[PDB]
Structure formats: structure tokens, C-alpha cells
Amino acid sequence: ATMTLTDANFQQAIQGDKPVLVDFWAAWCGPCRMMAPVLEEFAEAHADKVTVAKLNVDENPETTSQFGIMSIPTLILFKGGRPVKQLIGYQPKEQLEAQLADVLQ
């Protein structure tokens, strides 16, 4: 199961001190379907390391205004209330797995 963050728990979650890859996506989005199954397989890949969380920026609009999430999908890794790496668009699971290997270690 992937994690599911939400406006209130979102910032209280990341700002503590915890590796969490927040996935910003929407059910009305077009090219988020491309990486849709790699993201759920991404939680199958590392699993005991990556918290692949899910914010609906449609439903929860507070953090999308802070960062300015202008084009979903948008993956951002937070380790201690600070996005170490923002990458967006379609990125294969192979691009993801090497990208997140650096920050998770």
C-alpha cells in the first residue's frame, strides 16, 4: 500500500524528519497515467525505505500553492521538511530507482 498524505497531515508529516516521497497527482490529469503503474511498483521496489505518499492537489490545495505545482505529475522527495530533489513529467521506474537511491541512502 502506498501512503496517502493530505493537506493537514502533509506538512506535519514532512516537516518532522522522515524520508517521504510525496506524489502530487490528480485524477483529471493526462500524462500521469504514464507513470501511474511504475509508482505503485515503486512502492514494491524499495518498500521498506520509500514512503510513496499520495496527495490529491485537486482536493488538497494548501501545499500546491506553497511550492507552485504547475504541472502534474510532480514527484518531490522530502527528508526533513525540505525538498531535496524535484523531478517532474514522465520518468521511468528505472529513472526513479536510481534517482531515489541517492537520497534514500
UniProtKB/Swiss-Prot annotation:
One of its GO terms (biological process) is cell redox homeostasis. Keywords: Disulfide bond, Electron transport, Redox-active center, Transport. GO terms for cellular component: cytosol. It comes from the Bacteria. One of its GO terms (molecular function) is protein-disulfide reductase activity. Residues 1-105 form the Thioredoxin domain. InterPro entries: Thioredoxin, Thioredoxin-like_sf, Thioredoxin_CS, Thioredoxin_domain. Disulfide bonds join 29-32. Pfam families: Thioredoxin. Belongs to the thioredoxin family. Participates in various redox reactions through the reversible oxidation of its active center dithiol to a disulfide and catalyzes dithiol-disulfide exchange reactions. This is Thioredoxin. The lineage of its organism: Bacteria, Bacillati, Bacillota, Bacilli, Bacillales.
